[PDB]
Design a protein around this ligand. Structure first.
Ligand code: CHL
Ligand code: CHL
Ligand code: CHL
Ligand code: CHL
Ligand code: CHL
Ligand code: CHL
Ligand code: CHL
Ligand code: CHL
Ligand SMILES: CC1=C[C@H](O)CC(C)(C)[C@H]1/C=C/C(C)=C/C=C/C(C)=C/C=C/C=C(C)/C=C/C=C(C)/C=C/C1=C(C)C[C@H](O)CC1(C)C
Ligand SMILES: CC1=C(/C=C/C(C)=C/C=C/C(C)=C/C=C/C=C(C)/C=C/C=C(C)/C=C/C2=C(C)CCCC2(C)C)C(C)(C)CCC1
Lengths: 82, 41, 66, 220, 225, 231, 216
C-alpha cells in the first residue's frame, strides 16, 4: 500500500495543500480572504514556532481539505476507470 | 416548609387534591358496587 | 471577540417563597387579585418573559431553563 | 517548554502551576466568567491530579498481572489475568473463583469508595472540615493543607518527602500521570482492536515489528 | 432491532434518568450557574456546534446503531428467524464472524474504510432505493448509507463560522455584503435583530420547523421507512 | 523520641519521648488524644506481653513435642494426658473455658479499674496489708516484680520490654501466617527454608490455605478460616 | 458544634441540638416549622417505639424457633396461622377491639399534643399527676415510667433519650430490612442470618435471586 496509487494521491494532496497554506496561497488563521478574494493579515493570537505564521489549526484544516480532495479524486478515478 | 404548604394550599393544588379524592371515591364505590342504578339492596 | 464560557454564580435562590405568591413575576399581578380577571392574567402572562423584565440576560436565562 | 498556546491561554498560564506548558487551546482555564460550576480553574487542576493518580494506578495495574503471569511469578495463566478478562467486563471474560462474587465486591467497593470520595469532596468544599468530627481518631491526619490536590500530613505525606523539591515532585507526578492517562487510553484502544493483553501487544511488536502494529491489526 | 420487553424497559429507565438530568440542568443553569448574555449571543459557535455536533454526530451515531444493530437483526427478522432465536445486538458487536455471516464485507474490518476501498462496503452501504418487498419499508442499508452521508455533510457544514481560530465566516459580514440595486441597504441590521430579539428567532424557527413537519408527513407516507 | 522510624520524617507534637520505644510513629494519628494514647499504650503493653508468652510457648512446644502442630493444639486429643476428673478423666472444655473465664474476668476487671483510676485497686481486697506500688500505668510491680529489676534504669528496661514485645507480635503474626500457608510449625518452616531456600519460600506457599475449612471438636463444629483467601 | 450526619456540612438551621438524636439531618427541611417539628418528633418517637417492640417480637420468637425449642410461625405468616388456629375469634371482631383500644389511647395522646397537660384533670378514673406529661413525646409519671428512670437526674434522662431514639431508628431500619429480605428470599430474618453465618461468601444479596434479576 506504501507505493500504491491511493497512498500517493492522498500524500500528494495533503502535502500540496499544506505547502500552499504555508506559503500564503490559501486563507489561514493569520490571513483571511476578502469578498473580492484578497488575503489580508488577521491577528488570531495563536502562538506558533513557524516564522511564516503557520498555526496548528492551519495544519488541521489543510490536512482535512487535502484528505477530502484526495478521497474525492480517488473515488472519481475508480468510478471513471483509472 | 411553611412556603411549600402555602403553595399546596393554592386553589389549583387544592382543587387537584379534592377532585382526585372525589373521583377516586366515586371510582372505588363503582368498583366495589358495580352498576348502581337504583337505591335498592 | 473571544468565544468563551461565562456564567454568573448563584443568581437566584432556590426557595418556595414565590411559589406561595402567584403573579410574583409581574409588577401588576404581584399585588394580588381584585377581580377574576387576575386569575386568567396570571396564566396568560406566565411565559411572556419579555413582559416581566426588559433585561435581555434574564430573558435568555429563563428561556434556556424553560 | 511550550505546546500550541495562544494569547488567551498565556494570559493566566504563566508557569506557577505544576507541569505548565500553556496548553489550553480551548481556554478552559480562564478564571473570568467561570465562577460557579465544574469548569472553574481550581476544579480542573484538581480533576487532572485525580485522573493522574487513578491512571497511574490503572496503568501499573492493567499490565502487572499479565507480566507476572508471563514470567511465571503468579500461577494464573496470562490469558485469564488480562485486565479486561478479569471480570470488569463479563462479556470479555470473568475470572474463575474470586473469594467473593463481583457484584458483592462492587457493593463493598461502593460503600468504601463512597466513604473515601465523600470525605475528600467535603475537604474540597469545606477545607479542613474533615479534621473536626470524630472519625475513630483518624481526623487528626485528615485536616488537609488548604490545597485540595495536595493534602499531605502524617499519612498522605507520611515519609515527609518534598522538603525543598515539592514543586518538582508535583511536576513529576503530573508528568507521570499524563503518561499513565495516555497509557490507559492505549490499553483501551488496543483491547478493542487486538483483543489481547497490552503485554501481548508489546511482545508481538517486539518479536515482529513489521507484522504486528496498528496497520496490520486493522488489516484483518 | 428491539426484540424483547427488557430492552424497552431499559430505554424507559434510561429516559427517566436523562429526564431527571434535564430537570437538573434547568435548575442548575438558572439558580446556580446562569450563563451571561454574551454567552447566548455566540450564534456562530452555536451554529457550528448544532450542525457538526448535534446533527452531524447524531446522524453518525445513528448510522453506527443502524449498521451494527438494526441491519443484522432486521435481516434475520426478514429471513424468517424467530425473534427469540435472533442473537442479541452485543453478540453482533463482539463476534465479528457472526456479523460477516450476514454481511461478508465485515470480515475485512475497518481496512476498506481507511484504505479508501469504500466499494467493499457495498453489501451494507447500498443505494437500492424503493421499498423492501418483505416488509414494505425502506432498505435499512440505504438508511445507514443515508445517515452516514448526512453525518459527513453536517460535520462539514459545522465548520463554516469563525469562533476562536481566525478561519471561518462572520455572519454579520455575509449579511452586510449581500445588497443590491433594488434592495437598498440589503441585509444590514439583521444580525443585530437576530442576536437581540428572541421573537424574531422564534418566528424563523417556527416557520421552518412547521414546514419541516409537513414535509416529513409527505415523505413518511410516500417512502415508508 | 530522638531516633525516628524513618529518616527525614518528623515526630508528632504529642510523641516526644514520655513513653519507651517512642519512634514518633503515628501515621494515622490515633494517639493524638492523651486519653486514647493511654488506652492504646495499655493495649500495646498487654498485646506485647501476650505475644511474648505466645512466641515462647510456640517455640518451646516444638522442642518438647515436635509432632504436635501448635495450630491444632486446641484439639482434645492433642492435649496432654492428665486427669480432669469424672468417670474417665477426659477433657470437657466447658469447665476448662469456665476456669479461665472466671479467673480472667476477675484479673482483667482489676486491671481495667486500674486503667480508669490510677492507684484505685492497688490494695489487696482480702488481706488489706498487702499492696502494689504501681509507679506507672501498665507497670504494677510489687508481687509482679519480685526480683526488683526495675530499681535501676526503668526507662531502659521498659524500652527493652516494648521492643521485644513488638518483635514478638510481628513474630506471632508470622507464626500464624506460616502455619496457615504450610501446615507446619515455625521451626519446621525454618528447617524447610534452610533445606531448599529457592524451592521453599513464601512464593510457593502463599497461595495455599493448609488449614481445613471446619473441624469437629467433641460434638460441635467450629468453622475455620485462614487470614487470606487461600485454597 | 455537635456531631452531624454529613461531616463538613453544616447542620440544618432549624435543628439547634436540643432534641434527642439531633444530628442536623433535614435535607428536605421538613422540620422548619417548630409546631410541625414537635409533631414530627412525636411521629418519630411513636414509629421508633413501635418498631422496637415489633422487632423484638419478631426476633426473639424467631431465635427461639431456630433453636428448635418452639415452632412459632414467621412474622409474615403469623396472621394466617392465628386465623386458621382460632375459628371462634373472627378477624373483624379482633380488628374492632384493636381499633377502639388504640383509638382511646391515641386520642388521649392527640389531645395532649393539642393542649399539653389537659388529660391531667382527673376525668379518666381520677388519674391526675400521671397524665400531665413531662415533655413532648415523653409522658413519664408513675404509670408510663413506674421505675422513675426519668425523675432521677437530668443527665440520666438525656442519656436514656439518646439511647431510645438511636435504638428506635435502628429498629425502623431493621424492619425495613425485614421487609426487603422477606421479599427477596422468602424466609425469616433469623433464617437469613443463619444462612449467612453458614456460608457468607455465597449467601449474599447478590445470590438471592431478586436483587440481581439477571443470571450472572
Ligand atoms: C510547506 C512547508 C511547511 C509546512 C507544512 C510547515 C508546518 C509547520 N511548521 Mg514549518 N512548515 C513548513 C515550512 C518551513 N517551516 C520552517 C521552520 C519552522 C520552525 C522553526 C517551526 C516550524 C513549525 C511548524 C508547525 C507550525 C504549526 C504547528 O504548531 O503545528 C503542530 C507546522 C507543523 C513549528 C512548530 O510549531 O512545531 C514544530 C516550529 O517551531 N516551522 C521553515 C524554515 C524557516 C520552512 C521552509 O520551508
Ligand atoms: C479526479 C477527478 C474526479 C472525477 C473523474 C470525479 C467523478 C465523479 N464524481 Mg467526484 N470526481 C472527481 C474529483 C472530485 N470529486 C469530488 C467530490 C464528489 C462528490 C461529493 C460526489 C462526486 C460524485 C462524482 C460523480 C458525479 C456524476 C455526476 O455527473 O453527477 C451529477 C449530479 C447532479 C447533476 C446533481 C462522478 C463519477 C458523486 C458521487 O459520489 O457519485 C458517484 C458525488 O456525490 N464527487 C471532489 C471534492 C472533494 C473532487 C476533487
Ligand atoms: C383518593 C381516592 C381513593 C379512595 C377513597 C380509595 C379507596 C380504597 N382503595 Mg384506592 N382509593 C382511592 C384512590 C386510588 N386508589 C388507587 C389504587 C388502589 C389499589 C391498588 C388498591 C386500592 C384499595 C382501596 C381500598 C383500601 C385502601 C379502599 C376502598 C385496595 C383494594 O382495592 O381493596 C383492599 C387496593 O388493593 N386502591 C389509586 C392508583 C390508581 C388511586 C388514585
Ligand atoms: C346529571 C347527569 C347524570 C346522572 C343523574 C347520573 C347518574 C348515574 N350514573 Mg351517569 N349520571 C349522570 C351523567 C353522566 N354519567 C356519565 C357516565 C357514567 C358511567 C360510565 C356510569 C354512570 C353511572 C351512574 C350511576 C351512579 C350511581 C352511583 O355511583 O352511586 C354512588 C352514590 C354516591 C357516591 C353517593 C355519595 C355517598 C357518600 C360517598 C357516602 C347513577 C345512576 C354508573 C352506573 O352503573 O350506571 C347506572 C356507571 O357505571 N355514569 C357521564 C359521562 C362521564 C355523564 C355526563
Ligand atoms: C443543551 C445542552 C447544554 C448546554 C448548551 C450546556 C452549557 C453549559 N453547561 Mg450545562 N449545558 C447543557 C446541558 C446539561 N448541562 C448539565 C449540567 C452542567 C454542569 C454540572 C455544568 C454545566 C456547565 C455548562 C457551561 C460550560 C460548558 C461545559 O461545561 O462543557 C464542558 C463539557 C465537557 C467537559 C464534557 C462533558 C462530559 C460528557 C459526558 C460529554 C458527553 C456528551 C455527549 C452528548 C454524550 C452522548 C455521546 C456519548 C454517549 C458518547 C455551559 C454554559 C458548567 C458550568 O455551569 O460552569 C462553568 C458546569 O459546571 N452543565 C446537564 C446535567 C447532566 C445537562 C443535560
Ligand atoms: C486467645 C488466644 C487463642 C488463639 C490465638 C487461638 C487460636 C486458635 N485456636 Mg484456640 N486459640 C486461642 C485460645 C483458645 N483456644 C481454645 C480451644 C480451641 C479448640 C477446640 C480449637 C481451637 C482452634 C484454634 C485455631 C483456629 C481458630 C479459628 O480459626 O476459629 C474460628 C474463630 C471463630 C469462629 C471466632 C473465635 C474467636 C473470635 C476471634 C471471637 C472471640 C470470642 C469472643 C468470646 C466472642 C464473644 C462472644 C459473646 C457475644 C458472648 C487457632 C490456631 C481450632 C483449631 O484449628 O484446632 C485444629 C480448634 O478446633 N482452639 C481454648 C479453650 C481452652 C482457648 C482459651 O482461650
Ligand atoms: C497485587 C498483588 C496481588 C493480588 C491482588 C493477587 C490475587 C490473587 N492471587 Mg496472587 N495476587 C497478587 C500478587 C502475587 N501473587 C503471588 C502468588 C500467588 C499464588 C501462588 C496464588 C495466588 C492466588 C491469588 C488469588 C487468591 C488470593 C491469594 O492467594 O493471596 C496471595 C497473597 C499474596 C501473594 C500477598 C502478597 C487472588 C485472586 C492463588 C490463585 O492463583 O488461585 C486461587 C494462588 O494459588 N497468588 C505472588 C508471588 C509470591 C505475587 C507478587
Ligand atoms: C408491636 C408489638 C407486637 C405485635 C403487633 C405482635 C403480634 C403478634 N404476636 Mg408478638 N407481637 C408483638 C410484640 C411482641 N411479641 C412477642 C412474643 C410473641 C410470641 C412468643 C408469639 C407472639 C404471637 C403474636 C401473634 C398473636 C398475638 C396474640 O395471640 O395475642 C394474645 C393477647 C392476649 C392473650 C391478651 C393480652 C392480655 C391483655 C392484658 C388483656 C401476633 C401476630 C404468637 C404467634 O406468633 O402467632 C400466633 C406467638 O406465639 N408474640 C414479644 C416478646 C414482643 C415484644
Ligand atoms: C488538556 C487539554 C486542554 C485543551 O484546552 C482541551 C483538551 C484538548 C480537551 C485537553 C486535552 C486532553 C486529554 C487528551 C484528555 C484525555 C485524557 C486521558 C485519557 C483521561 C484518562 C483517565 C484514565 C484514568 C481515570 C484511569 C483509571 C484506570 C482504572 C484505575 C483501572 C482499573 C483496572 C484495574 C487496574 C485492573 C482491573 O483488572 C480492571 C480495572 C478495574 C478496570
Ligand atoms: C515541514 C516541517 C515539519 C513537518 C511537518 C509535518 C510533516 C506535518 C504533517 C502534518 C500532516 C500531514 C497533517 C495531516 C492532517 C490530516 C488531517 C487533519 C486529516 C483529517 C481527515 C478528516 C477529518 C477526514 C474526514 C472524513 C472522513 C472520516 C470520512 C468521510 C470523508 C472525510 C474525508 C471528510 C516540522 C514541523 C517537523 C519541522 C519544520 C518543517
Amino acid at each position: 500500500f506504501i507505493g500504491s496509487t491511493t497512498n500517493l494521491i492522498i500524500c500528494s494532496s495533503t502535502a500540496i495543500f499544506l505547502a500552499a497554506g504555508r506559503f500564503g496561497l490559501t486563507p489561514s488563521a493569520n490571513r483571511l480572504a476578502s469578498p473580492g478574494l484578497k488575503l489580508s493579515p488577521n491577528n488570531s493570537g495563536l502562538q506558533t514556532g513557524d516564522p511564516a505564521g503557520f498555526t496548528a489549526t492551519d495544519v488541521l484544516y489543510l490536512g482535512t481539505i487535502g484528505h477530502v480532495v484526495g478521497i474525492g479524486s480517488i473515488l472519481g478515478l475508480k468510478a471513471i476507470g483509472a | 416548609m411553611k412556603n411549600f404548604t402555602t403553595y399546596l394550599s393554592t386553589a389549583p393544588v387544592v382543587a387537584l387534591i379534592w377532585f382526585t379524592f372525589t373521583a377516586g371515591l366515586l371510582i372505588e364505590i363503582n368498583r366495589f358496587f358495580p352498576d348502581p342504578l337504583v337505591f335498592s339492596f | 471577540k473571544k468565544v468563551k464560557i461565562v456564567v454568573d454564580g448563584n443568581p437566584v435562590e432556590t426557595s418556595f417563597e414565590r411559589w406561595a405568591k402567584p403573579g410574583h413575576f409581574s409588577r401588576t399581578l404581584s399585588k394580588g387579585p381584585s377581580t377574576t380577571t387576575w386569575i386568567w392574567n396570571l396564566h396568560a402572562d406566565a411565559h411572556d418573559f419579555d413582559s416581566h423584565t426588559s433585561d435581555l440576560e434574564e430573558i435568555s436565562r429563563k428561556v434556556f431553563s424553560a | 517548554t511550550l505546546l500550541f498556546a495562544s494569547d488567551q491561554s498565556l494570559s493566566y498560564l504563566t508557569g506557577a502551576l505544576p507541569a505548565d506548558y500553556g496548553f489550553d487551546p480551548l481556554g478552559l482555564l480562564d478564571p473570568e466568567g467561570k465562577g460557579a460550576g465544574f469548569v472553574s480553574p481550581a476544579w480542573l487542576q484538581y480533576s487532572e491530579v485525580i485522573h493522574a493518580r487513578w491512571a497511574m494506578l490503572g496503568a501499573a495495574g492493567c499490565i502487572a498481572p499479565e507480566i507476572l503471569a508471563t514470567a511465571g511469578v503468579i500461577p494464573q495463566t496470562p490469558d485469564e489475568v488480562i485486565w479486561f478478562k478479569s471480570g470488569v467486563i463479563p462479556p470479555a471474560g470473568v475470572y474463575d473463583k474470586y473469594w467473593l462474587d463481583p457484584y458483592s465486591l462492587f457493593f463493598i467497593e461502593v460503600i468504601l469508595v463512597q466513604f473515601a470520595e465523600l470525605r475528600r469532596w467535603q475537604d474540597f468544599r469545606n477545607p479542613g472540615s474533615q479534621g473536626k468530627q470524630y472519625f475513630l481518631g483518624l481526623e487528626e491526619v485528615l485536616k488537609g493543607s488548604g490545597d485540595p490536590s495536595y493534602p499531605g500530613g502524617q499519612f498522605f505525606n507520611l515519609f515527609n518527602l518534598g522538603k525543598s523539591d515539592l514543586k518538582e515532585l508535583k511536576t513529576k507526578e503530573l508528568k507521570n500521570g499524563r503518561l499513565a492517562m495516555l497509557a490507559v487510553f492505549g490499553y483501551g484502544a488496543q483491547a478493542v482492536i487486538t483483543a489481547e493483553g497490552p503485554f501481548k501487544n508489546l511482545t508481538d511488536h517486539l518479536s515482529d515489528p513489521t507484522g504486528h502494529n496498528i496497520l496490520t491489526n486493522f488489516g484483518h | 432491532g428491539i426484540t424483547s420487553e427488557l430492552q424497552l424497559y431499559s430505554t424507559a429507565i434510561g429516559g427517566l434518568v436523562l429526564a431527571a438530568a434535564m430537570f437538573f440542568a434547568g435548575w442548575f443553569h438558572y439558580h446556580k450557574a446562569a450563563p451571561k448574555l454574551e454567552w447566548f449571543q455566540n450564534v456562530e459557535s452555536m451554529l457550528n456546534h448544532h450542525l457538526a455536533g448535534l446533527l452531524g454526530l447524531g446522524s453518525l451515531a445513528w448510522a453506527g446503531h443502524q449498521i451494527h444493530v438494526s441491519l443484522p437483526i432486521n435481516k434475520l427478522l426478514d429471513a424468517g428467524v424467530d425473534p427469540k432465536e435472533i442473537p442479541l445486538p452485543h453478540e453482533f458487536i463482539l463476534n465479528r464472524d457472526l456479523m460477516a455471516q450476514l454481511y461478508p464485507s465485515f470480515s475485512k474490518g475497518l481496512a476498506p474504510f481507511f484504505t479508501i476501498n469504500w466499494s467493499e462496503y457495498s453489501d451494507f452501504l447500498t443505494f437500492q432505493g424503493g421499498l423492501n418487498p418483505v416488509t414494505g419499508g425502506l432498505w435499512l442499508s440505504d438508511q445507514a448509507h443515508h445517515h452516514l452521508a448526512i453525518a459527513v455533510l453536517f460535520l462539514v457544514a459545522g465548520h463554516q463560522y469563525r469562533t476562536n481560530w481566525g478561519i471561518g465566516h462572520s455572519i454579520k459580514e455575509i449579511l452586510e455584503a449581500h445588497k443590491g440595486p433594488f434592495t437598498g441597504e440589503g441585509h444590514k441590521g439583521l444580525y443585530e435583530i437576530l442576536t437581540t430579539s428572541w421573537h424574531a428567532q422564534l418566528a424563523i424557527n417556527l416557520a421552518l420547523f412547521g414546514s419541516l413537519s409537513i414535509i416529513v408527513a409527505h415523505h413518511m407516507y410516500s417512502m415508508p421507512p | 523520641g530522638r531516633r525516628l522510624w524513618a529518616p527525614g520524617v518528623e515526630a508528632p507534637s504529642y510523641l516526644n519521648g514520655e513513653l519507651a520505644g517512642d519512634y514518633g510513629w503515628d501515621p494515622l494519628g490515633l494517639g493524638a488524644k492523651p486519653e486514647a494514647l493511654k488506652w492504646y499504650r495499655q493495649a500495646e503493653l498487654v498485646h506485647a506481653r501476650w505475644a511474648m508468652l505466645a512466641v515462647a510457648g510456640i517455640l518451646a512446644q516444638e522442642i518438647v513435642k515436635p509432632g504436635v502442630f501448635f495450630y491444632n493444639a486446641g484439639l482434645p486429643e492433642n492435649l496432654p494426658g492428665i486427669n480432669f476428673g469424672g468417670p474417665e478423666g477426659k477433657v470437657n472444655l466447658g469447665g476448662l473455658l469456665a476456669w479461665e473465664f472466671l479467673l480472667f474476668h476477675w484479673v482483667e476487671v482489676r486491671r481495667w479499674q486500674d486503667i480508669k483510676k490510677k492507684d484505685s485497686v492497688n490494695q489487696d481486697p482480702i488481706f488489706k496489708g498487702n499492696k502494689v506500688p504501681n509507679p506507672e500505668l501498665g507497670y504494677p510491680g510489687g508481687i509482679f516484680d519480685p526480683f526488683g529489676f526495675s530499681k535501676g534504669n526503668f526507662k531502659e528496661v521498659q524500652t527493652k520490654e516494648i521492643k521485644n514485645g513488638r518483635l514478638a507480635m510481628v513474630a506471632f503474626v508470622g507464626f500464624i501466617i506460616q502455619a496457615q500457608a504450610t501446615g507446619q510449625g515455625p521451626l519446621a518452616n525454618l528447617g524447610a527454608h534452610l533445606a531448599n531456600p529457592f524451592g521453599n519460600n513464601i512464593t510457593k506457599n502463599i497461595g495455599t490455605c493448609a488449614i481445613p475449612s471446619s473441624v469437629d471438636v467433641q460434638g460441635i463444629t467450629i468453622p475455620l478460616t485462614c487470614l487470606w483467601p487461600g485454597h | 458544634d455537635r456531631q452531624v450526619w454529613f461531616p463538613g456540612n453544616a447542620p440544618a438551621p432549624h435543628l439547634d441540638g436540643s432534641l434527642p438524636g439531633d444530628f442536623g439531618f433535614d435535607p428536605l427541611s421538613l422540620g422548619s416549622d417548630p409546631q410541625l417539628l414537635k409533631w414530627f418528633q412525636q411521629a418519630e418517637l411513636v414509629h421508633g417505639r413501635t418498631a422496637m417492640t415489633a422487632v423484638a417480637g419478631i426476633l426473639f420468637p424467631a431465635v427461639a424457633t431456630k433453636a428448635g425449642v418452639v415452632n412459632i410461625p414467621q412474622w409474615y405468616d403469623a396472621g394466617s396461622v392465628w386465623v386458621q388456629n382460632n375459628p371462634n375469634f373472627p378477624f373483624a371482631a379482633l380488628l374492632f377491639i384493636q381499633i377502639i383500644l388504640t383509638g382511646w389511647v391515641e386520642t388521649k395522646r392527640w389531645l395532649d399534643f393539642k393542649n399539653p397537660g389537659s388529660q391531667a384533670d382527673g376525668s379518666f378514673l381520677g388519674v391526675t399527676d400521671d397524665f400531665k406529661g413531662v415533655a413532648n413525646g415523653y409522658p413519664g409519671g408513675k404509670l408510663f415510667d413506674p421505675f422513675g428512670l426519668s425523675r432521677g437526674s437530668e443527665g440520666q434522662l438525656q442519656k436514656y433519650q439518646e439511647n431510645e431514639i438511636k435504638n428506635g431508628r435502628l429498629a425502623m431500619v431493621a424492619f425495613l430490612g425485614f421487609i426487603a429480605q422477606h421479599a427477596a428470599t422468602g424466609k425469616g430474618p433469623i433464617d437469613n442470618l443463619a444462612d449467612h453465618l453458614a456460608n457468607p461468601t455465597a449467601v449474599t444479596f447478590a445470590t438471592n435471586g431478586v436483587s440481581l434479576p439477571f443470571v450472572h
